[PDB]
Amino acid sequence: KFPRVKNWEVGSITYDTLSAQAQQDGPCTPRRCLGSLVFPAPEQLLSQARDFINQYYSSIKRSGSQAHEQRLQEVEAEVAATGTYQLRESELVFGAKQAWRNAPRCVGRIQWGKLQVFDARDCRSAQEMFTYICNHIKYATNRGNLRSAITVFPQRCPGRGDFRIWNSQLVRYAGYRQQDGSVRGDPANVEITELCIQHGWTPGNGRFDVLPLLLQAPDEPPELFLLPPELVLEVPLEHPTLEWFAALGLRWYALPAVSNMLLEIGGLEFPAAPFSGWYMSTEIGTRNLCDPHRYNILEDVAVCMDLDTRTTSSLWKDKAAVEINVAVLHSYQLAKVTIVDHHAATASFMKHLENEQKARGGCPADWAWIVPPISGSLTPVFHQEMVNYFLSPAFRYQPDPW
Amino acid sequence: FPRVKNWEVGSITYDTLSAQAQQDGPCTPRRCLGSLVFPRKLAPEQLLSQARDFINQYYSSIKRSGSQAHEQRLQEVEAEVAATGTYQLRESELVFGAKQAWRNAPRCVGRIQWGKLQVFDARDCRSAQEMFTYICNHIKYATNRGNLRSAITVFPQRCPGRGDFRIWNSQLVRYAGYRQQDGSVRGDPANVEITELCIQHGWTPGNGRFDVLPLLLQAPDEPPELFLLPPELVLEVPLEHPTLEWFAALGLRWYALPAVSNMLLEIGGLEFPAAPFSGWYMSTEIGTRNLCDPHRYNILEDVAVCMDLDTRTTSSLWKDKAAVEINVAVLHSYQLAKVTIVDHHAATASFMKHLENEQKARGGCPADWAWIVPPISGSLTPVFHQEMVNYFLSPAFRYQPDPW
Numbered sequence: 001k002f003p004r005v006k007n008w009e010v011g012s013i014t015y016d017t018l019s020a021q022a023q024q025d026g027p028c029t030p031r032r033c034l035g036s037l038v039f040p041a042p043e044q045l046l047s048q049a050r051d052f053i054n055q056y057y058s059s060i061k062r063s064g065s066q067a068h069e070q071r072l073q074e075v076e077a078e079v080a081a082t083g084t085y086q087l088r089e090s091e092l093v094f095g096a097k098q099a100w101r102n103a104p105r106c107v108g109r110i111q112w113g114k115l116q117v118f119d120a121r122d123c124r125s126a127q128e129m130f131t132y133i134c135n136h137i138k139y140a141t142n143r144g145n146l147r148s149a150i151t152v153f154p155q156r157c158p159g160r161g162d163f164r165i166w167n168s169q170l171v172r173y174a175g176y177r178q179q180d181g182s183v184r185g186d187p188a189n190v191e192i193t194e195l196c197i198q199h200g201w202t203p204g205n206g207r208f209d210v211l212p213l214l215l216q217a218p219d220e221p222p223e224l225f226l227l228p229p230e231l232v233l234e235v236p237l238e239h240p241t242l243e244w245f246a247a248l249g250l251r252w253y254a255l256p257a258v259s260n261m262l263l264e265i266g267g268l269e270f271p272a273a274p275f276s277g278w279y280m281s282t283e284i285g286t287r288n289l290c291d292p293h294r295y296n297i298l299e300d301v302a303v304c305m306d307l308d309t310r311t312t313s314s315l316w317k318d319k320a321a322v323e324i325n326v327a328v329l330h331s332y333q334l335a336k337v338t339i340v341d342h343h344a345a346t347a348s349f350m351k352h353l354e355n356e357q358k359a360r361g362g363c364p365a366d367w368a369w370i371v372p373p374i375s376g377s378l379t380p381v382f383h384q385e386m387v388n389y390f391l392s393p394a395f396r397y398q399p400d401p402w
Numbered sequence: 403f404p405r406v407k408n409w410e411v412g413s414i415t416y417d418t419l420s421a422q423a424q425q426d427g428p429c430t431p432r433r434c435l436g437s438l439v440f441p442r443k444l445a446p447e448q449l450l451s452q453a454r455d456f457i458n459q460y461y462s463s464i465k466r467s468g469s470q471a472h473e474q475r476l477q478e479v480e481a482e483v484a485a486t487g488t489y490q491l492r493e494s495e496l497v498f499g500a501k502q503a504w505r506n507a508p509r510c511v512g513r514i515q516w517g518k519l520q521v522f523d524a525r526d527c528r529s530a531q532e533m534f535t536y537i538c539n540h541i542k543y544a545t546n547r548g549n550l551r552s553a554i555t556v557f558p559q560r561c562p563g564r565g566d567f568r569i570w571n572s573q574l575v576r577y578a579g580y581r582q583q584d585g586s587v588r589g590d591p592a593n594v595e596i597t598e599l600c601i602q603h604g605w606t607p608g609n610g611r612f613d614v615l616p617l618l619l620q621a622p623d624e625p626p627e628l629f630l631l632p633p634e635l636v637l638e639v640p641l642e643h644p645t646l647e648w649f650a651a652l653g654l655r656w657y658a659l660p661a662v663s664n665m666l667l668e669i670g671g672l673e674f675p676a677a678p679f680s681g682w683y684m685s686t687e688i689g690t691r692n693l694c695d696p697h698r699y700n701i702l703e704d705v706a707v708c709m710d711l712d713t714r715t716t717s718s719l720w721k722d723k724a725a726v727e728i729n730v731a732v733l734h735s736y737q738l739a740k741v742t743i744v745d746h747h748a749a750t751a752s753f754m755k756h757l758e759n760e761q762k763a764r765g766g767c768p769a770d771w772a773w774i775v776p777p778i779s780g781s782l783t784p785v786f787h788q789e790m791v792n793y794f795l796s797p798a799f800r801y802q803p804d805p806w
């Protein structure tokens with residue numbers, strides 16, 4: 001009674017037995033599927049903790065041992081005396097990697113074992129928090145040879161408020177409301193842009209103004225910190241054979257660092273644990289630049305290309321979008337900044353699936369997010385059936401602190 | 403009542419119609435199986451309850467719920483099943499059920515058209531030659547010299563005991579798939595099987611990679627018999643490119659009529675194992691999936707070499723550039739041949755409008771996001787940013803086992 005999962009390109013068949021271990025419940029029922037929705041104490045802290053400790057001791061091939069039973073006993077003793085417990089350094093590293101390994105919407109998981117874990121659980125103030133973040137950005141950027149990383153700030157604990165990064169990513173561009181009712185810059189960042197200004201940021205008026213950080217230490221208001229210009233590696237966009245493209249003045253940044261998600265490990269919660277990888281080119285070309293509710297450049301590019309935008313059957317949108325993606329891949333390669341195209345990325349994710357099937361007997365994967373937003377069926381993940389479910393450790397969404 | 407958001411515009415709606423969904427799907431709170439193509443697998447007390455449900459909505463759809471023959475029609479079906487074990491549908495019920503089954507198909511992006519459907523009633527057919535003639539009137543009517551019209555032909559319902567009418571081909575028009583001393587296929591690899599069944603039932607094979615297969619039609623109980631399609635009934639389109647002069651020399655073609663002939667129409671508890679339906683193509687079905695899938699004609703590499711694309715590195719997006727032009731050549735060729743076709747932008751835009759109508763009419767719409775979003779340029783179309791609820795309503799088209 002485990003789901004049978006077929007690849008329709010090749011004919012292979014597997015069964016996802018890992019799904020029967022799904023340590024939480026999602027939004028679907030036998031009556032209706034909600035798979036496409038974007039947003040779907042001591043004794044229970046104890047069972048989450050015991051399950052994680054069991055996982056950790058499996059991964060080091062030491063399950064059911066003395067050191068294993070001791071650690072379980074230590075944990076339930078700590079939860080008795082304090083209502084919580086502290087992870088050892090090696091458990092934190094393993095926990096952070098599993099949460100990446102368990103993220104069902106991430107197509108980059110072939111890399112999950114190569115993660116640099118920075119332990120900032122001794123962090124003390126917003127100012128120290130800024131220092132750790134700058135170090136993260138600089139290590140992860142690495143002059144364009146990007147490295148995956150996560151920095152873990154102190155956990156949620158009773159008595160004190162949370163560390164929070166108010167920005168959804170460490171690097172985002174401002175979005176300024178206009179007189180047209182329109183938006184200058186990134187429309188997805190209007191809210192954080194207004195928050196910054198009302199916390200004392202002098203706004204610019206460009207389309208690619210990098211936003212300051214809003215950092216919150218426990219029981220403190222958020223504090224504003226400017227990122228040093230030379231810390232934020234950016235890439236001017238040009239096209240290899242459409243020379244007018246460089247005159248659009250488009251740019252994107254090197255480092256995708258998500259900073260507003262909650263990291264859950266063995267019952268414990270880290271509301272501030274930003275992590276970074278490297279971009280897949282369609283994130284920039286298709287979503288960030290062509291979405292009508294983002295920079296929405298697609299029709300402007302198509303007009304410049306002398307495509308017939310009068311009629312949809314010329315496929316002018318598909319043509320413009322492929323060329324924007326080409327420009328993205330060419331610009332990053334030219335600037336020597338790590339980037340992966342959706343063909344290579346999905347191919348390596350197929351290898352991840354085969355790796356995971358041998359290791360854990362399955363892989364949580366969200367088909368609608370794994371399949372790229374252009375050229376879906378040209379990639380191998382399109383013809384691969386998938387089973388979505390929630391494993392822990394996990395990265396979870398959390399409400400905005402404001 | 404599930405909250406459903408459109409992320410492109412910000413609108414929010416509630417799918418109250420999902421509450422009235424019955425036949426359970428494959429998902430559970432612990433794991434989602436929405437991406438699976440065939441979910442799970444494939445005392446006449448049950449027949450009455452389904453029969454009375456179907457009758458009730460029929461009379462709600464014509465206002466007349468409340469006294470009148472509405473009261474009356476519930477009785478005849480009661481009596482008919484009490485006497486015979488099955489029942490027969492009144493002709494307007496069969497039309498209404500056929501339309502609703504289409505309206506309820508969660509994977510269909512063309513449902514804006516659900517009201518305009520021609521229903522050919524072939525329930526009095528009792529022969530294989532009769533089926534064949536019924537099929538040909540359909541193909542002729544549906545094709546209509548290239549001005550395609552949606553049509554379904556309903557053959558007699560399955561009766562308890564004694565066999566089924568059935569069409570063996572998955573579609574009325576399919577291209578041959580021939581193996582060889584390479585293990586590879588010439589023709590359509592998706593139809594390797596039904597060609598095997600075509601030859602072993604007495605068919606003479608063909609030349610190359612665009613040979614229209616014969617129909618394997620099966621009257622109840624006695625084995626299927628071959629039927630050869632008249633060429634002038636099979637409108638095909640040869641594929642050319644508006645500016646790439648060499649594309650035509652590649653020798654590709656596709657047929658005009660997508661007519662599905664292996665699904666089971668279920669109305670009011672009755673099951674019709676032979677009810678072939680047809681509409682018209684979205685161009686990505688031909689360009690992207692039929693011609694470009696690695697397990698189909700797989701032409702993508704050949705078109706890239708002719709375009710002089712850099713096939714040495716994935717990062718040139720040569721696959722994406724070649725695929726767009728194939729689609730452009732499909733749209734162009736069908737327009738030149740005055741054959742009805744629709745691009746994935748127009749189709750998805752119409753489907754958004756269908757979603758809004760259905761919100762007003764029934765308070766929701768079953769939609770399978772992974773099949774509604776086109777296989778190319780997905781996020782460039784409005785359905786991409788539209789959350790959708792998938793569930794089973796009746797009347798419905800279902801998949802069914804193959805007859806071997």
Ligand code: HEM
Nearest residue numbers: 100103105106107108111148149275276277278279280395
């Ligand atoms: C190294 C290269 C990486 C690539 C190419 C990559 C790629 C992606 C992509 C394309 C998405 C979907 C986003 C979208 O389409 O809107 C995603 C989601 C996600 N990624 Fe990865 N990623 C990488 C590294 C990482 C790392 C290092 C982490 C954390 C340790 C991570 C965690 C996640 C999570 C949690 C999600 C889901 C976020 C959500 O559900 O909203 N990724 N990734």
Ligand code: HEM
Nearest residue numbers: 504507508509510511512515552679680681682683684799
């Ligand atoms: C009139 C123009 C029509 C268009 C453009 C259209 C388009 C489509 C497309 C693109 C699919 C997805 C198939 C795939 O890519 O695998 C589909 C599926 C389907 N269509 Fe439509 N179709 C049309 C008419 C019809 C009609 C007339 C009927 C029935 C009377 C119908 C019933 C279905 C069903 C039952 C499915 C599969 C649903 C499922 O598997 O749950 N369609 N259609």
Ligand SMILES: Cc1cc(N)nc2cc(-c3ccc(OCc4cccnc4)c(CN)c3)ccc12
Nearest residue numbers: 038108256257258275276277278279280283409
């Ligand atoms: C480490 C990493 C590397 C990479 N290369 N890529 C990444 C993309 C995301 C990502 C996560 C959630 C997202 O979405 C959240 C959201 C909020 C509101 C509405 N829709 C969606 C999006 C963009 N969709 C991207 C997260 C991490 C990424």
Ligand SMILES: Cc1cc(N)nc2cc(-c3ccc(OCc4cccnc4)c(CN)c3)ccc12
Nearest residue numbers: 008439512660661662679680681682683684687
């Ligand atoms: C009336 C109509 C019009 C149109 N314009 N288009 C249509 C496409 C399909 C259709 C239904 C099921 C399908 O899938 C069957 C299948 C078999 C094996 C593996 N997976 C899936 C496919 C192709 N995917 C197309 C059905 C009807 C269509």
Ligand SMILES: C[C@H](O)[C@H](O)[C@H]1CNc2nc(N)[nH]c(=O)c2N1
Nearest residue numbers: 036368369370409786787788789
């Ligand atoms: C409504 C829709 O399901 C939603 O906007 C999803 C669809 N699939 C996606 N897939 C990826 N990779 N990224 C996304 O942001 C989305 N958005």
Ligand SMILES: C[C@H](O)[C@H](O)[C@H]1CNc2nc(N)[nH]c(=O)c2N1
Nearest residue numbers: 008382383384385437438772773
């Ligand atoms: C594995 C995957 O779910 C499967 O290949 C589906 C995905 N979506 C699809 N969507 C359409 N329209 N047609 C298809 O054949 C498929 N294939």
Ligand SMILES: [Cl-]
Nearest residue numbers: 256283284288
């Ligand atoms: Cl981004």
Ligand SMILES: [Cl-]
Nearest residue numbers: 660687688692
């Ligand atoms: Cl087809």
Ligand SMILES: [Gd]
Nearest residue numbers: 240241242243
């Ligand atoms: Gd040029």
Ligand SMILES: [Zn+2]
Nearest residue numbers: 028033429434
């Ligand atoms: Zn589901």
